[PDB]
Amino acid sequence: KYTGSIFKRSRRLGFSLLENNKEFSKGKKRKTIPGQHGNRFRSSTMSGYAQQLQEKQRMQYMYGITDKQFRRLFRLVLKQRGNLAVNLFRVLESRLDNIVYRMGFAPTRRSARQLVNHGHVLLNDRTVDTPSIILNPGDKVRLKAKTIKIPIVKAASESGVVSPFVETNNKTFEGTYVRFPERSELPAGINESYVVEWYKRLVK
Amino acid sequence: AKKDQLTLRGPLYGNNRSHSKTITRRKWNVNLQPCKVKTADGKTTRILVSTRTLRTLKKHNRLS
Amino acid sequence: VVNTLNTNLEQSTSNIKNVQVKHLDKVSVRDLMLANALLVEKEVLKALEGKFK
Amino acid sequence: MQRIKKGDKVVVITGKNKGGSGIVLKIMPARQQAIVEGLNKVTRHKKKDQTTKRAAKQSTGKVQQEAPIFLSKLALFDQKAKQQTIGKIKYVMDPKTNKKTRVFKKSNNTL
RNA sequence: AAAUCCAGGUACGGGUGAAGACACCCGUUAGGCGCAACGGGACGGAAAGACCCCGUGAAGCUUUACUGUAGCUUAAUAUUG
RNA sequence: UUGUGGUAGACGAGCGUUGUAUUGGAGUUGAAGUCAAAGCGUGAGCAUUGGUGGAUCCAAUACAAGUGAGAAUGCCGGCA
RNA sequence: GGGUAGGUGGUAAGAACCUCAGAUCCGGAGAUUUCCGAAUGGAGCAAUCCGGUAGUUGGAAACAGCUAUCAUUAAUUGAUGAAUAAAUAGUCAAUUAAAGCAAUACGUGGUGAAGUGAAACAUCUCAGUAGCCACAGGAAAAGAAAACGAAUGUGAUUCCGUGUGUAGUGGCGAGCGAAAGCGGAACAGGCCAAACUUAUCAUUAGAUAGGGGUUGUAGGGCUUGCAAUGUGGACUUGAAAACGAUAGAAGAAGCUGUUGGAAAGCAGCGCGCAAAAGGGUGAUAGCCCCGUAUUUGAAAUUGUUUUCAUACCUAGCGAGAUCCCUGAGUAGCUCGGAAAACGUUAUUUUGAGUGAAUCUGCCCAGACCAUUGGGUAAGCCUAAAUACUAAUUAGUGACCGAUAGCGAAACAGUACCGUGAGGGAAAGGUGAAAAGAACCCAGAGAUGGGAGUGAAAUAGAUUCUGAAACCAUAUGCCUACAACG
Ligand SMILES: [Mg+2]
Ligand SMILES: [Mg+2]
Ligand SMILES: [Mg+2]
Ligand SMILES: [Mg+2]
Ligand SMILES: [Mg+2]
Ligand SMILES: [Mg+2]
Ligand SMILES: [Mg+2]
Ligand SMILES: [Mg+2]
Ligand SMILES: [Mg+2]
Ligand SMILES: [Mg+2]
Ligand SMILES: [Mg+2]
Ligand SMILES: [Mg+2]
Ligand SMILES: [Mg+2]
Ligand SMILES: [Mg+2]
Ligand SMILES: [Mg+2]
Ligand SMILES: [Mg+2]
Ligand SMILES: [Mg+2]
Ligand SMILES: [Mg+2]
Ligand SMILES: [Mg+2]
Ligand SMILES: [Mg+2]
Ligand SMILES: [Mg+2]
Ligand SMILES: [Mg+2]
Ligand SMILES: [Mg+2]
Ligand SMILES: [Mg+2]
Ligand SMILES: [Mg+2]
Ligand SMILES: [Mg+2]
Ligand SMILES: [Mg+2]
Ligand SMILES: [Mg+2]
Ligand SMILES: [Mg+2]
Ligand SMILES: [Mg+2]
Ligand SMILES: [Mg+2]
Ligand SMILES: [Mg+2]
Ligand SMILES: [Mg+2]
Ligand SMILES: [Mg+2]
């Protein structure tokens, strides 16, 4: 509204209050901000639940999930018969891209998800574009021919690498399974069941 | 304008309530009083500032 | 009235403005009584009794 | 490419003129018509106008010309076949010249 | 061209009637249609009366009507020893 | 058997227009529109034929309304 | 690049050319871009006038061509420099940004009425609405507890439903109306100051540039050890891949007869379909044409996502010392206002005045005190869900169909009105195809009557259908002694 001259006022004081609040020294912190936030965890003393929270974070990251979707899946599995500690494991592992990553035609789970979303993926009684469909223990997932028309091929090799709960024949692009992954195939990255109780408190 | 030069704090507009609660818009003006300070080789330059800022300068040793 | 969404059946009956195919969770009262005729799958019928309860 | 070009023999399959064989002299793609010689003969009542060196005479009586016809009413005429018939055409691309060529679908005749 | 115009084929006297009738009742008079005139009537035309009243209508103006306020004046307080 | 004058008003039963959904049907051998006539109904209203017209329309059951013109010194257009 | 055999934009015929060494046309990227206009060399009555400077070409010079540059403000730097020694003010030069517009729409902030209701009216309502102004952005604002609030409680902000028209607030009148809790959409928490320490400033630093730190079941610093070399970001550069956007390619299937001017209608016999959406073709076409379903394709520009590497941030649990730091004209208080549902009041904010304390600390739990409990003010940044559509692409309508729908289907904000701001219309349809009536007669001609084209000319440019009011002609009946809704 005139010659405000921040030099005139800032130096006018050299400390003051307005001077120090604005103090151009104001850095960027433009890397400090991001990373620390990123994601944290640890366990504390007063609530115990700290363990549950950290474990929940790990599990969701292992499959790339948003907390809201997780609450939905827990609600689904919760009601049925009884001690369903065998059901929700199948539910969490029934993800189509999860099956695609354990099937072995992608270098990483999220990359497999990208593929799925880009329409690589052919099913049985149906087809698939959405990377969240719950598959049934005994289901087939015939891979497209167009993807093979783009030989990067490097994948087929991973396919054979596989994990026992997945039965897929390389090159020939086909997959199904039975005897759903036992806890051995769900390694100690997240192997606890009081995260279930954490969601029982938070989700009715 | 009728405003301080150190800060940007200006007038305060409000209501003039009287008996019978009659409403009339009024303006409170800040006490702009001239003041001289020593900055950049102590160069004194008269600056119209609010008495509040005048007290702040006096306590901050700036006003000398 | 179809329970498993067969693709070969859906590829046909799409150029026919007369006939149409729907899932059990998709048929309504009006689609049922506009039919004048319908072909129902056996497993669709088993799901029908289940839905009625 | 186009179904009808300038020069190929063509016939009419609808209207008062049935089985009218002719040669397309000019094609207007925008309004989708076609001038075919010998067909759609109209007779403008030629008046007399004299305002130019050529208009000083402009001898015009009952000149019979050509009226344009919609391309839908036109159909290609077969020539290679011993028994000529009217049919539809494809747009096969022969790798010999990598050029698109019209081929009939009730026979194997090019153009 | 113009304002006007519910449809009209549109007499007078007495009476009647929303209380002053071309149209109602009872009588009298009058062939159909123009043109030039003059204004008696059609409570003639033009202007949802300006007078009067009504509206818990509007606006202008006045004052020791009410409530406020610009301005003017006095004191405390800060700049202020 | 008792009834059926009627304003303000209350209640009940219906007609008509356009479109949508289901059924059926007519139409260049002539639909809608539009004019005329010596028809049918208790009422809104509904037909038959002929002329003109040149491409959509009808019947039934439901549904949704910009759904019914004689008046507002009403608006617009035309003509006295 | 695609794509062909036509093209030279519409009222538009003709003349003259271009085009198969690949035209016109479509898409991507560029070139040129007069003058006015933020207009910015100076002015000015907009699209005009008058220049300066540095080059270069003609002239013998004035001069005239051809180029580039010349506004103001703010920031940085350098030079010069007054009253008045120094030093500043000031002056000059260089570099970097700012100006303005629009999307009749959303955001924030400042300012801020009245008509009206209360059946009058002043408190109040209307309403923090209209308007005025400033600043943006693709969203903005808000935001990580000195919180809610009454409990073995929840644990940033935002938006939706309910709580409810509830508690309350109101000339307790008209009216106004939450905050908790619960159910959902999305979800993310970060960073400085101070301590302590390093280096440098006539080191009077009280200043500059680094390491250290970011808190509440208190945190950090001081000294002393163990465990760590990771996981993750709101992240930089690159490389690779995938999914698209901006032109396109291919894309099945019918004949006969009848009415008819014309078949696609109607009838007979067939055929195709991942195509029976639609448009045109002389009537109403799945199979006449263009297309549609489906399969495909990008030289160039651009969007999203993924993989790998690469900068830049990011890390646990102990011991002792009892020492230091934790945001002051600040929180409170007084006098006038306001924000919250509240008409001012515990909480929030401020115009004037005054004014604290430092974890045995401070604030809060609707006056206030004590106990209990909750939380860490006076510093900063923060994606997502949320608000809107002038515009681009696709599509839909128990939406309108020339008095309707935008004022504007046509060349409409035009004609026109007003000094100006401003106000503001009406008007669409020949025929399948102009085949738009050559020619004859009357007439000065327009025109009319024939002829001709056409299925139709009573479809003729006055051009789809053509209602009533209104004006004329005529068959038949009645009417000039007659008082007439
Ligand atoms: Mg008021
Ligand atoms: Mg007149
Ligand atoms: Mg009397
Ligand atoms: Mg009068
Ligand atoms: Mg009156
Ligand atoms: Mg009054
Ligand atoms: Mg009043
Ligand atoms: Mg005084
Ligand atoms: Mg009655
Ligand atoms: Mg109907
Ligand atoms: Mg008729
Ligand atoms: Mg109406
Ligand atoms: Mg080219
Ligand atoms: Mg008022
Ligand atoms: Mg009132
Ligand atoms: Mg009133
Ligand atoms: Mg923001
Ligand atoms: Mg594609
Ligand atoms: Mg094609
Ligand atoms: Mg085809
Ligand atoms: Mg068709
Ligand atoms: Mg307090
Ligand atoms: Mg308030
Ligand atoms: Mg404490
Ligand atoms: Mg603090
Ligand atoms: Mg209009
Ligand atoms: Mg009209
Ligand atoms: Mg004018
Ligand atoms: Mg004629
Ligand atoms: Mg006329
Ligand atoms: Mg007409
Ligand atoms: Mg007589
Ligand atoms: Mg007589
Ligand atoms: Mg009489």
**Domain boundary assignment for chain D:** 1-111
Query: Interface of chain A against chain B, CB under 8 Å?
Result: 1, 9, 11-18
Q: Nearest Cα to A124, choosing from D12, C8, D98, B26?
A: C8
Say whether residue A81 is in contact with chain C using an 8 A CB cutoff: no
Cβ-defined contact of B60 to A15 (cutoff 8 Å): yes
Q: Is D109 exposed, middle or buried (0-12, 13-18, 19+ CB in 10 A)?
A: middle
Kindly list the residues from chain A whose CB atom is less than 8 angstroms away from the CB atom of residue B43.
none
Is C24 in contact with C51 (CB distance < 8 Å)?
Answer: yes
Q: Establish if C5 touches chain A: CB-CB under 8 angstroms.
A: yes
CA D95 → CA B16, C8, D3, D98, D106, distances in Å?
94, 36, 21, 5, 22
Q: Which residue has the tokens 């189509």?
A: A96
- For residue A94, the tally of other CB atoms under 10 A from its CB is 17
Residue among D32, D5, D16, D26 nearest D102 (CA): D5
Touching status, chains A and B (3+ beta-carbon pairs under 8 Å): yes
Strand blocks (E) in D48-102: 69-70, 74-76, 89-90, 93-94, 99-100
- Experimental approach: cryo-EM
CATH code, A92-183 = 3.10.290.10
Spatial contact of D75 and D86, defined as CB atoms under 8 Å apart = yes
Which amino acid belongs to residue A86?
A: V
Concatenated DSSP letters of A67-136: HHHHHHHHHHHHSSSS--TTHHHHHHT-BHHHHHHHHTSSSSHHHHHHHHHTT-EE-SSSEE--TTPBPP
Residues D39, D12: contact at Cβ < 8 Å? yes
> CA-CA-CA-CA torsion for B18, B22, B24, B29, nearest 10 degrees?
20
Residue A55 to chain C, least CA–CA distance (Å): 38
The residue type of A19 is: E
**Would you call A126 an interface residue with chain C, using a CB distance cutoff of 8 Å?**
yes
Chain A residue closest in CA terms to C3? A125
- Are A166 and A177 in contact by the 8 Å Cβ rule? The answer is yes
Euclidean distance between CA atoms D106 and A126, whole angstroms:
39
CB-based contacts of A166: which residues, under 8 Å, 6+ apart? A99, A102, A103, A104, A175, A177
Resolution (A): 3.7
Domain with CATH 1.10.1050.10 in chain A: 6-91+188-198
The span from the CA of A150 to the CA of A193, in Å, is 42
Q: How far is the CA of B35 from the C1' of G304 (A)?
A: 60
Name D89's Cβ contacts closer than 8 Å, sequence gap at least 6: D3, D76, D102, D103, D104, D105
- Please give, rounded to a whole number of angstroms, the shortest distance from the CA of A187 to a CA of chain C: 35
- In which residue are the tokens 């009262």 written? C29
Own/partner pairs, A114-123, CB within 8 angstroms, 24+ separation: A115/A147, A119/A144, A120/A144, A120/A146, A120/A147, A121/A96
Placement of tokens 């880009």 in the chain: A118
Cα torsion through B58, B59, B60, B62, rounded to 10:
20
* Residue C20 contacts A, CB cutoff 8 Å: no
Other beta carbons within 10 Å of A117: 15
Strand E within 7 A of B33 CB:
yes
Distance CA D95, CA B49 (A): 90
User: D1 CA distance to ligand 5 centroid (A)?
Assistant: 83
In terms of CATH, what superfamily is A6-91+188-198?
Ribosomal protein S4/S9, N-terminal domain (1.10.1050.10)
Residue type, D70: F
In chain C, residues with a C-beta closer than 8 Å to the C-beta of A127 are 7
* CA A146 – CA A154 distance, rounded (Å): 15
- For residue A41, the SS3 value is coil
Nearest to A90 by CA among A200, A181, A194, A195: A181
